[PDB]
Write a protein that binds this ligand. Sequence first.
Ligand SMILES: *[C@@H]1O[C@H](CO)[C@@H](O[C@@H]2O[C@H](CO)[C@@H](O)[C@H](O)[C@H]2NC(C)=O)[C@H](O)[C@H]1NC(C)=O
Ligand SMILES: *[C@@H]1O[C@H](CO)[C@@H](O[C@@H]2O[C@H](CO)[C@@H](O)[C@H](O)[C@H]2NC(C)=O)[C@H](O)[C@H]1NC(C)=O
Ligand SMILES: *[C@@H]1O[C@H](CO)[C@@H](O[C@@H]2O[C@H](CO)[C@@H](O)[C@H](O)[C@H]2NC(C)=O)[C@H](O)[C@H]1NC(C)=O
Ligand SMILES: *[C@@H]1O[C@H](CO)[C@@H](O[C@@H]2O[C@H](CO)[C@@H](O)[C@H](O)[C@H]2NC(C)=O)[C@H](O)[C@H]1NC(C)=O
Ligand code: NA
Lengths: 463, 463, 463, 463
Amino acid sequence: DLRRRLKYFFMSPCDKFRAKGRKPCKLMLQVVKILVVTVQLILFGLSNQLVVTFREENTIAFRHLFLLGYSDGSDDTFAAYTQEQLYQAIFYAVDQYLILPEISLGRYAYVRGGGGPWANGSALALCQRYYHRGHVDPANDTFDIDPRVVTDCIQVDPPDRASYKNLTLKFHKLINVTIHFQLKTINLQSLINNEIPDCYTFSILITFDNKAHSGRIPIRLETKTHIQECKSFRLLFDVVVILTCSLSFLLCARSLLRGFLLQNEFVVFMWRRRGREISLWERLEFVNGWYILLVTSDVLTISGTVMKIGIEAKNLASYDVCSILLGTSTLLVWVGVIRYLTFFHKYNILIATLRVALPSVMRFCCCVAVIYLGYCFCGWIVLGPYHVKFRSLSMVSECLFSLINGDDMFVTFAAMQAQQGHSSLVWLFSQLYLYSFISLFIYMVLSLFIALITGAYDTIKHP
Amino acid sequence: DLRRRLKYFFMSPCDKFRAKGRKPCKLMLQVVKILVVTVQLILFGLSNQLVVTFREENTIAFRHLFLLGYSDGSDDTFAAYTQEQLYQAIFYAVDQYLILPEISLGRYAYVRGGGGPWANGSALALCQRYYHRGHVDPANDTFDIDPRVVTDCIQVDPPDRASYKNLTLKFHKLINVTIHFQLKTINLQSLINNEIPDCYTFSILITFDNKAHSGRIPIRLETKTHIQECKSFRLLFDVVVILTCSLSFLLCARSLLRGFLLQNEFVVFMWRRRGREISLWERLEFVNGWYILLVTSDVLTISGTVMKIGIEAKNLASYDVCSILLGTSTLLVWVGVIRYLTFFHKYNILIATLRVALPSVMRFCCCVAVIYLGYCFCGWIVLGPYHVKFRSLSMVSECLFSLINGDDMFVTFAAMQAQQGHSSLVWLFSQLYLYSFISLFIYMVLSLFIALITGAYDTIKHP
Amino acid sequence: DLRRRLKYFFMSPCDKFRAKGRKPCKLMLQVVKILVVTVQLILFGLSNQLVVTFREENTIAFRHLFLLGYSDGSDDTFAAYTQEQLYQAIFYAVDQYLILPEISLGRYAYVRGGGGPWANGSALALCQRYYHRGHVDPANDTFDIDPRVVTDCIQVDPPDRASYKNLTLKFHKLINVTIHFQLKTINLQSLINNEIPDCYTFSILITFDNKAHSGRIPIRLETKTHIQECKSFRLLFDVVVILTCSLSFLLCARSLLRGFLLQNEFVVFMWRRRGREISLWERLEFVNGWYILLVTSDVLTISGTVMKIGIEAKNLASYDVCSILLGTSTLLVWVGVIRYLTFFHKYNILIATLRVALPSVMRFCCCVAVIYLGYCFCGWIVLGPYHVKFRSLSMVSECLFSLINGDDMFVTFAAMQAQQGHSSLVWLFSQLYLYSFISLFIYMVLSLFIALITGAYDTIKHP
Amino acid sequence: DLRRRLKYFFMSPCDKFRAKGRKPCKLMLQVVKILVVTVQLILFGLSNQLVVTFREENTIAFRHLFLLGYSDGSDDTFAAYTQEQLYQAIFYAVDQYLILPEISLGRYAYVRGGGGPWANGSALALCQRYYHRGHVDPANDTFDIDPRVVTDCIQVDPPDRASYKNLTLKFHKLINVTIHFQLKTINLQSLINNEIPDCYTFSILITFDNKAHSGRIPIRLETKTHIQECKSFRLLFDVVVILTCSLSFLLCARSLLRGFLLQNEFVVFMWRRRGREISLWERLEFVNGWYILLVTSDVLTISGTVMKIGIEAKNLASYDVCSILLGTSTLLVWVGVIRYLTFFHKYNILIATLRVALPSVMRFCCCVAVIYLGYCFCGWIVLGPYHVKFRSLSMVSECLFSLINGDDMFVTFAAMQAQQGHSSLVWLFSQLYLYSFISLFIYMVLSLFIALITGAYDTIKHP
Ligand SMILES: *[C@@H]1O[C@H](CO)[C@@H](O[C@@H]2O[C@H](CO)[C@@H](O)[C@H](O)[C@H]2NC(C)=O)[C@H](O)[C@H]1NC(C)=O
Ligand SMILES: *[C@@H]1O[C@H](CO)[C@@H](O[C@@H]2O[C@H](CO)[C@@H](O)[C@H](O)[C@H]2NC(C)=O)[C@H](O)[C@H]1NC(C)=O
Ligand SMILES: *[C@@H]1O[C@H](CO)[C@@H](O[C@@H]2O[C@H](CO)[C@@H](O)[C@H](O)[C@H]2NC(C)=O)[C@H](O)[C@H]1NC(C)=O
Ligand SMILES: *[C@@H]1O[C@H](CO)[C@@H](O[C@@H]2O[C@H](CO)[C@@H](O)[C@H](O)[C@H]2NC(C)=O)[C@H](O)[C@H]1NC(C)=O
Ligand code: NA
């Protein structure tokens, strides 16, 4: 029959050793996999942190070198308010660029033809964009504008070791002013420490943005970095990671296939013996969710390791997707560690408590999500104009989540005390809104989450 | 009789389909209403955010243009402390106003006669207010003051492209100095993006307030904006919103009326059959609270949509009331979504847990509110002089609420460590006050809220 | 006998009306008392806030007028680091004092003889204190100091509308430099609004403190204010407050005396009937704790009202003690409001839950206080040198309390990440200390408080 | 037999008095020990705080004296960005050092030969370090570097009351620039207050660090202090501490030895009477854990007191280890205070509740630690480049711990809203990561901790 086969299946690894004397291969392989994946992620994180620190420090140096009157911390408020200030900022940026070799503490090299498409072989491009026809005249509300964008460009070349000074900005119809150039440096730490030199090409963009046309022109500098190679153990270890995950995926897929075949045999033998309807959950009882998690983590690790091999060879530079894949896979394997604790009764009590509480917790989350969403919409529409924490829907959701978790509460109240929402009515509404929301979610909703978990634990302890 | 009528009534929509074969019309109509109300609120919020951002950026530009030595973040501390500083601030504001066209990054137009009532056709009014008779002499405490307010005005006209320099401030009897003028600009983003041009008239008020007579004269700039039209789908969609809510209100009112008639028939038939006293709750059992919520949300949505139509046509500019109405209605419909979850048993368990816990929670709120109020009064009276967070009763309440919810606790303690309330006694009292309050409300009151919710859940699970 | 007397006693006010038809006099009198005490405290708080605001604004103006290079917010860091800086600060303070009448926005009058004991009729005293013999010579560690303090004074008189410039500071043996003078002003708001003029005499003290002898000399300005009268309903309302509290105290004391006499009769009649030992709690069962609270609040209100009458007449100026008395009395009466809720069963359930939980809560507080104190001592001794939040024992206690209540946690961790306690060992110890403390108190101690409250509620619900 | 011996053993101190009439000696000795240890730690903390304050104030004065354009709070951002700025900072530091005697408010003495190994008898050493061969040329990626470090030194001597101006920095190959000198001062507070003079020798190090080679050269000043004696009750009290702890350790060790002998007699008598297997816990039942704690605290106190005697005599200066030992011992004795509360039933209820809950709490901590670690690794790898709170693994752990305890939540969300992780994908991942983590740990894990404690309390109350 099959009761002997279903006995060996659905049975603990410790009991599995007693029958047929099968050595635990999947058991040790998963531990080895967890070790190697954690080590690989740690090494990747360390190298990435070094690269990130180099990029950030160089960008800060660029901001102090090219932005007129720049101080640390004033990034989102750095702006120009007069025509002379804008002219001075643009001219200071270009002049500092032209005298960079003998003022800069870092060794940056000019890149010929680095100004972008609007630079035809010139290193720096000084571009101003404006509408084709502005005809803005608020004296008697006579408007006549052609929304076509005109790009006026000035070509700047560094000296071999002043046209741009004759720049006329069409202030009434101006869209933005941009400065494009590239700087090339060599990461010395790589040239000494790991003996693998890295050549960085920073693409500096300085924007004087006037798209709001509000009299305030913010100024920002952003840098894009391209890391080439100047004209191992990690690769071998990344090969070990791929092999271990491949073997783990193979074994887990084999186990899943055997489970599927066994459940098919069971469901046909039920109808053969006593015709009865197989429940959907009973079919789902033959598939081990831990193996689905294991194959998911194996696939994520393999893809992330391929992308990591591409990145380490300076061919991909897609750090975000690779980091997400590796982090998700590592999270999944460290979560899958719980399967070993499910073999011991006293840990299984707590794990089963969480498992039996989870459906009710999800149902209550669905119940309270609609109240949460209504509060989010109401707060965004009413407090959005007046409260800095309510400007966007995502910001409102973050603020309300922190409020229900007991964080940043007094600042939310105090922001509304400052200007009183420019109307006693808005202040009173904010009072009612915040007090009712915080009281409802903390004293009732959180308490009900506690009650659900306590009830699940009570059922587990006394079945 | 009526037991057949009361069976169809008071019965689930799924069961309602089986009897008489009535299609669910109110069911789908409420879903459509929720969708259209949420979409309308999102569109309104996006447009309002654009308008708010334009206003804020222009006001920041005005502050940087007209306030002498202004830096971002120093709004509530910006003040003058000497006579020369006040003169320089006033003169700088007027001079910047007079040279605005050739310094400003935005295109602002002068408004003739924009200085207000004290400007008889002049664009800028420079007004100083002082008492009729001051005779302030602290040398030997000889006071003689006439509380009549005298308004001395200077008329300033922009050049066609210096009387105000002879300004003598009566410093000993001065009340405030104000500068009134208007600037007109065109929101270019509207002129391009939505092809509907908007003409903004900012009314700038610069106040040099000396009403405290404390030697410190704060300086602030506030702007009032009037949005006209320079010389659709939203309107049609707002018509759909009104129609949907009108139909929903009609159906809900019809259902409420039928319920009232049915309960009248029931209460008369009770006395006809067996004379017994109808309980107040039993009469209240015939009215569906969900329909009261639905009609309330329908009325709020209709009023808010009418005001939104008025605002979008540049006729109302009452954004606060319209936003409050729309937000409250959207919150109400998203709360009313719960009625659908009450049809399913496993969600109904949690909803009924909250419902049966609510009366005890309100009773305990009433019990602890008096302790909370006593603490608020005591903290306001004792810690008000010394603690920045205890200056007003509303501020005290906000601080204590954040304290009981575990927020901004260390800052409250640290503010009292700084100056020690200028007396060891006040510091010791603040120690006892804060420790006792936080210990009482967190360890006992919150725990009792948890206990009440747990007890209600236990009663629901095991009736 | 006495069972009829004990029946009328120990009985609810509603039941008390049915027997003997006694009108509730104490019931309405306490409500009136709560009303009048709250109104009195609110009026007192409003007037005190006006006075505090005037004082603070004048002190800020003084700081901007007399402290060289002073900016807002730099109060605890304002210091001098060179001899020239100290000379310049002292000279700037004196020069600004001498030209105050024609630079200051407020109208301050010179006070002749206001420099204190070291000024013999002069308005300003410029005092430097130093040791009699310093002989400080770190070249070869030759010390010879006489700890006697010498006070060298310079007398400064304002002009009728430069000796101090020849000031030589004994820098090696200097203790501090102080500038004493007084300024007289009239609070104009009082001169108009309430028509009761107030004459303020600010005593300005500028300290250049060198008692640390650490090369850094902090500079601070502190002001003492004396409010005289320039050469009602509140008084009548404060008389009503005294009368109401006197009558309440009389009635409550009479009730307490009757209870004492009744318990004496009961305890003698027990021995007369059946000789048995009266329990200590049984004797304590005859005294109503609410009446003890009422007499305490009455006495506090009477004392605070007497002191308030003294203050309002400009005879006391002891605001701290009066405010503490009034606030404590108001807190006590608002707490005593609970007695009315004890008459209704559903509120009595919650109140009795808290009452029966309180002894166990206090016992657990005693149990966990010793662990808390050990953590406080350990953190003060180890993290005190390196952590700004652990400098003093009270500061350590405040930090740990906020930590267990889930506030300011990440900043505490981040302060230790910054310098790592200048030793990996201290950083590791801080890691273990903070993690163990927060885990122990939040996950175990707070949970046990919740469990105690839940158990008390369960006993109350099912006796 | 031994049932009479085991009766006197394993028995409360109050019961122990009734049998054999033994006076409680260990009982009073532990109270005396707690008192003397707390007093000793308080005295040590006060003296250490005075020393720490002197060091910190002198270091702040040094920063204001020697760092060009230094302001308070700008320590981790203080940096140079141009060659001229670096030259000016170095020259300003040396010039201020050379004119220190007539500008400084503190009395600092030059130390001849205080520049360190690179100063051969000179007081100040101005050292620049650079690679032997740099040949850095990013123009065409021609690198040729010799990682050997060359130390170029300039010798500076103070005047008896300019070579360094000819300093040429090899900017392309520069590693760092350091300035070494020593200053000697006498703590005057010690010279007066405690009449024990202290001679401080500060070793000032100014670093211009270019090891990142990123164009930004941070500047920092760090001071090492050596406290000698210029050319009691505490010692006697520290002798009392050693004697008390020695006697306590002797008595506790004697009790532990008697317990071991008694358990050996019991285990042999069991086999003599009825051969049965002694359980491991039963053997562990004979050893009092409180005595192990007492001997541990005694040893820690003795070692810390020896080191404190060494420190107070200016022979050790190892404050960290001594402070850790004393703090840990004081924490242990204040924890051991609980043993007295275990003698009383109502406190024993709560203590036993915690004790029986502890194993399940540890098991659940192990269960949730793997999920926590997976989240830590994922957040470090993905959010590390973009979030300031996720730069290091310890920082990630601290952030997540504060998040689960409801602290610094909105700032974590807002940091990701600012730049959106430079990619919508990273922002969406951070949204999912933070929401899922906070929801899982607060609503489920903390609730299960509460449930475990409640269950343990329920078992204790109803065995
Ligand atoms: C300055 O404004 C212009 C619009 O006038 C922006 O031009 C757009 O640039 C993006 C990306 O470079 C293109 O995809 C669009 O097609 C461009 N639009 C037009 C109309 O040319 C430009 O990006 C702005 N500069 C900055 C730095 O934001
Ligand atoms: C400057 O002070 C005067 C009072 O001297 C304020 O005048 C009041 O203004 C409000 C609103 O404009 C009126 O309702 C009052 O009737 C005015 N009172 C008097 C006595 O004229 C004026 O508002 C203050 N200016 C500012 C900007 O606050
Ligand atoms: C400046 O230092 C002197 C000590 O040299 C302080 O003098 C003490 O002042 C207090 C209160 O005024 C008196 O109770 C003490 O008796 C004084 N001691 C001595 C030795 O005279 C003085 O207070 C300090 N000044 C400031 C502003 O702190
Ligand atoms: C400046 O950089 C040099 C490296 O060029 C650092 O020198 C190291 O110093 C430490 C401690 O002083 C020694 O243990 C190492 O052996 C030194 N390395 C070399 C290669 O000499 C120096 O510490 C740096 N200065 C500062 C202030 O950080
Ligand atoms: Na919190």
